[PDB]
Design a protein around this ligand. Structure first.
Ligand SMILES: *[C@@H]1O[C@H](CO)[C@@H](O[C@@H]2O[C@H](CO)[C@@H](O)[C@H](O)[C@H]2NC(C)=O)[C@H](O)[C@H]1NC(C)=O
Ligand SMILES: *[C@@H]1O[C@H](CO)[C@@H](O[C@@H]2O[C@H](CO)[C@@H](O)[C@H](O)[C@H]2NC(C)=O)[C@H](O)[C@H]1NC(C)=O
Ligand SMILES: *[C@@H]1O[C@H](CO)[C@@H](O)[C@H](O)[C@H]1NC(C)=O
Length: 519
C-alpha cells in the first residue's frame, strides 16, 4: 500500500486541501506555495513523505507536522526560508532545508531528539561551530550544507568540527574565488564532497583551497573524496591530484572541471598513496584545448588499479614507463585514436578496458594493442568508426579476451575472421553485417552474441549445430526475408530454444514473430 499524490508543477499557491486521507506520499514540488500551516497537512494521518521543494516558503514552524506521526521524510529545499521556529515535533529520518536564505544555521534543539535523522540539508551564510551542538551527539549519515553566496565574512575555522556525520557535502558559493578558511577535515567524515572550487588567479594558485585539502591528510577516517564544478589553472589542477595523492583517500572522484593556462607541472610523485580508484569526468580546457605535453605522462604512469577519464579532449594515452598496476581502465568518451597504448608490454595485469566513443578506426591496430595485455578479459570499443580490413590478415588478439563489445561501428561480415578464439560475449549491434559466414562454427565457447540493428536477411542452414554454449542472442531490428524455405531452419530451430532469444526479431514487411512460421 502506498497512496501517492503527485501535484508537482501545478502552479499551486497553497497546499491542496481536497487530498485523500490515504495519502502516504505527497509531492507538491515546483509550485508557488508561500506558507505551510498545521491545518494544511494535519488531516493526512498516514503521510510519510512530504516534498514541497522548489516553492517559496519563507517561514518554517517545525510543529506544523506535529500531528503527522508517520512523517519521516521532509524536503523543503529550494524555497525562500529565512526564519525557522523551534518547537517539539515528529522524529524525521530525512530533513532537507538546503538552498534556502537562512542567515544562521537552521538547527533547532528539538533536532536532537531525532534519533533516526539520517540526512540533514542545511542553508546558511554564517557558520558558528557552536550552533551545530544540538546534533553533535547524533550519528547522522549525510549532511548537505549550502553556503550562501554572501558567505565569507567572519569565518569560523572549526565551524564543522562538531558535525558527527559519515558523509559531508559542502556546497561552496558560486561565481566566487575560493578564499574560505573552514576546516573540512571532520573527525567522523569518511566520504567528503566539495562543490564549486574556483581559483583562476596569479596572486596565489589556489593556496587557500590547497590548504584545507592538506588537512585531509591527518585523518585516517577519510576514505572517499569527491570534487565537483572546479575552475582553475592546469597547474593548480595537477597540484590537487598530487596533494590528494598522499592523503588517506581510497576513492577520489572529480567531475565538471574547467581548466586554463599552459601546463608546466611534470614531476609527479606517485609514492605514498592509498588510492584504489580515480575517475575524472567532464574536463573542459581553454581556447588552446587539451595540453599537448606532460598530462598523458602523468596519467599513464599512475600507480593505481582503477582509473577513469571521460568527457575530455584527450587524444593519447601512452605505455606506462614501468610495469603498470592498471586493472580497470575506462577511457570512454574522449578523442583517443588507435595508437593508444601501442607497443606496450607493461599492461599485463589489465583485465578490462573501455574505449567506447573515441576515434578508433582500424581493428587490426586495436587487436595489436591487445596482444601483450595478457590478462585482458573485457574490451569495449563501441561507438567509434572501426572497420576491419580482411587484407591485413589474422588479428593478434590476446588469448585471454572473453568479452568484446564492438557495437556502433562500420564492421562487415569479415569481422568474424578477426575475433579472439575464446570469445564468450560478442556485441556487434549497429554495424553493417549482411551475412553470417562459416567461420562462426569455430566459436564453440560463445555464450552471448548481439547482432541486432544490422542488415541480416537470413542465416545458413545449420550454422548453430556446433555452438552448444550459447545462452543469449539478439536478432531484432534486422530485415529478415521470411519466404519459405529461406526462413524454415530459422523457424523450427528458434521455436525449440524458446528462452535463448532476447527481444523479438520480426519479419521484413510481414512483421510476424519469426517463431510463428510453418514451412
Ligand atoms: C574498478 O572498476 C570496476 C569496473 O571497471 C568495478 O567493477 C564492477 O563493480 C560493479 C559495482 O556495482 C559490479 O556490479 C560489477 O560486477 C563490477 N565488475 C567487475 C568486472 O568486477 C570495480 O568495483 C572497481 N573497483 C574499485 C575498487 O573501485
Ligand atoms: C556495448 O556497449 C553499448 C554502448 O555503446 C551497450 O549498449 C546499450 O545497450 C542497452 C541494451 O543492452 C540499450 O538499452 C542501449 O540503447 C544501448 N546503447 C546504445 C547507444 O546502443 C551494450 O549493451 C554493450 N554490450 C555489452 C555486452 O555490454
Ligand atoms: C516529486 O516531483 C518532482 C517534480 O516532478 C520530482 O523531481 C521528484 O523526483 C518527485 N519525487 C517523488 C518522490 O515523487
Amino acid at each position: 500500500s502506498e497512496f501517492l499524490v503527485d501535484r508537482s508543477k501545478n502552479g499551486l499557491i497553497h497546499v491542496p486541501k481536497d487530498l485523500s486521507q490515504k495519502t502516504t506520499i505527497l509531492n507538491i514540488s515546483q509550485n508557488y506555495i508561500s506558507e505551510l500551516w498545521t491545518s494544511d497537512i494535519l488531516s493526512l494521518s498516514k503521510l510519510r513523505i512530504l516534498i514541497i521543494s522548489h516553492n517559496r516558503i519563507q517561514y518554517l514552524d517545525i510543529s506544523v507536522f506535529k500531528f503527522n506521526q508517520e512523517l519521516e521524510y521532509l524536503d523543503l529545499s529550494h524555497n525562500k526560508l529565512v526564519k525557522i521556529s523551534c518547537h517539539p515535533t515528529v522524529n524525521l529520518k530525512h530533513l532537507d532545508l538546503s538552498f534556502n536564505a537562512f542567515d544562521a544555521l537552521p538547527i533547532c534543539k528539538e533536532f536532537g531528539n531525532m534519533s533516526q535523522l539520517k540526512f540533514l540539508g542545511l542553508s546558511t551564510t554564517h557558520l558558528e561551530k557552536s550552533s551545530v551542538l544540538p546534533i553533535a551527539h547524533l550519528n547522522i549519515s549525510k549532511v548537505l550544507l549550502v553556503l550562501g553566496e554572501t558567505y565569507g565574512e567572519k569565518e569560523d575555522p572549526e565551524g564543522l568540527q562538531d558535525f558527527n556525520t559519515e558523509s559531508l557535502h559542502i556546497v561552496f558559493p558560486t561565481n566566487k574565488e575560493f578564499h574560505f578558511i573552514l576546516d573540512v577535515s571532520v573527525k567522523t567524515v569518511a566520504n567528503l564532497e566539495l562543490s564549486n572550487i574556483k581559483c583562476v588567479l596569479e596572486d596565489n594558485k589556489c593556496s587557500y583551497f590547497l590548504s584545507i585539502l592538506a588537512k585531509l591528510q591527518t585523518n585516517p577516517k577519510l576514505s572517499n573524496l569527491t570534487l565537483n564544478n572546479i575552475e582553475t589553472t592546469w597547474n593548480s589542477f595537477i597540484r590537487i591530484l598530487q596533494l590528494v595523492w598522499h592523503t588517506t583517500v581510497w576513492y577520489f572522484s572529480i567531475s565538471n572541471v574547467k581548466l586554463q593556462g599552459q601546463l608546466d607541472f611534470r614531476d609527479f610523485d606517485y609514492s605514498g598513496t592509498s588510492l584504489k580508484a580515480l575517475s575524472i569526468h567532464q574536463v573542459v580546457s581553454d581556447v588552446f584545448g587539451f595540453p599537448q605535453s606532460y598530462i598523458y605522462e602523468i596519467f599513464s604512469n599512475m600507480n593505481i588499479k582503477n582509473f577513469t577519464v571521460s568527457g575530455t579532449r584527450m587524444v593519447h594515452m601512452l605505455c606506462p614507463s614501468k610495469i603498470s598496476p592498471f586493472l580497470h581502465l575506462d577511457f570512454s568518451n574522449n578523442l583517443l585514436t588507435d595508437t593508444v597504448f601501442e607497443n606496450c608490454g607493461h599492461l599485463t595485469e589489465l583485465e578490462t578496458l573501455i574505449l567506447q566513443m573515441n576515434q578508433l578506426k582500424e581493428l587490426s591496430k586495436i587487436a595489436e594493442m591487445t596482444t601483450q595485455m595478457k590478462s585482458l578479459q573485457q574490451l569495449d570499443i563501441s561507438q567509434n568508426s572501426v572497420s576491419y580490413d580482411e587484407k591485413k590478415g589474422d588479428c593478434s588478439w590476446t588469448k585471454s579476451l572473453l568479452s568484446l563489445n564492438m557495437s556502433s561501428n562500420i564492421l562487415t561480415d569479415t569481422i568474424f575472421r578477426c575475433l579472439p578464439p575464446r570469445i564468450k560475449v560478442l556485441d556487434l549491434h549497429s554495424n553493417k553485417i549482411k551475412s553470417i559466414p562459416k567461420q562462426v562454427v569455430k566459436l564453440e565457447a560463445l555464450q552471448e552474441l548481439n547482432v541486432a540493428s544490422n542488415q541480416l536477411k537470413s542465416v545458413p542452414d545449420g550454422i548453430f549445430d556446433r555452438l552448444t554454449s550459447l545462452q543469449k542472442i539478439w536478432l531484432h531490428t534486422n530485415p529478415w526475408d521470411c519466404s519459405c524455405p529461406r526462413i524454415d531452419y530459422l523457424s523450427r530451430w528458434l521455436n525449440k530454444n524458446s528462452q535463448k532469444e532476447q527481444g523479438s526479431a520480426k519479419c521484413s514487411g510481414s512483421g510476424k514473430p519469426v517463431r510463428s512460421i510453418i514451412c
